[PDB]
Amino acid sequence: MRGQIRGLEMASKNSQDGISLIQTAEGALTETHAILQRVRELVVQAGNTGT
Amino acid sequence: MRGQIRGLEMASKNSQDGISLIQTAEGALTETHAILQRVRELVVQAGNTGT
């Protein structure tokens, strides 16, 4: 039991650490995405306003 | 009778001595076990927290 208990404590630890990794990459990709919104703004402008 | 009596006195002695040996090894194995609990904690952490 205690072997598993302690393993579950370190499991919770490892999973929370998983979450930390996730949210790191998550926020980074959110910012990336926001850039890409700006990019498409610049694409539509980089329709040259036509000519 | 007295031969057996005296032999029972030394028998009790020998058995108590048995117990002393037992409880020595017992407590030692209890501590060993406690270590092994810590080990498994370090195994679950030595899941590398994954990567």
From chain B, the residues in CB contact with A5 under 8 A are none
Instruction: Find the CB nearest B40 among A7, A14, A18.
Output: A7
Q: Answer for the pair A16, B50: CB distance below 8 angstroms, yes or no.
A: no
To which residue do tokens 């998983």 refer?
Answer: A18
The candidate with the shortest Cα–Cα distance to B41, out of A16, A18, A12, A9, is A9
Where would I find the H helices in B1-51?
Answer: 2-45
The DSSP call for residue B1 is -
Q: Answer for the pair B45, A9: CB distance below 8 angstroms, yes or no.
A: no
Tell me the two tokens of residue B16.
Answer: 């108590």
What is the structure's resolution, reported in angstroms to one decimal?
Answer: 5.7
Secondary structure E strands in A1-51: none
Q: Which residue from B minimizes the CA distance to A11? A: B44
Tell me the two tokens of residue B21.
Answer: 């040996």
Query: How was this model experimentally determined?
Result: cryo-EM
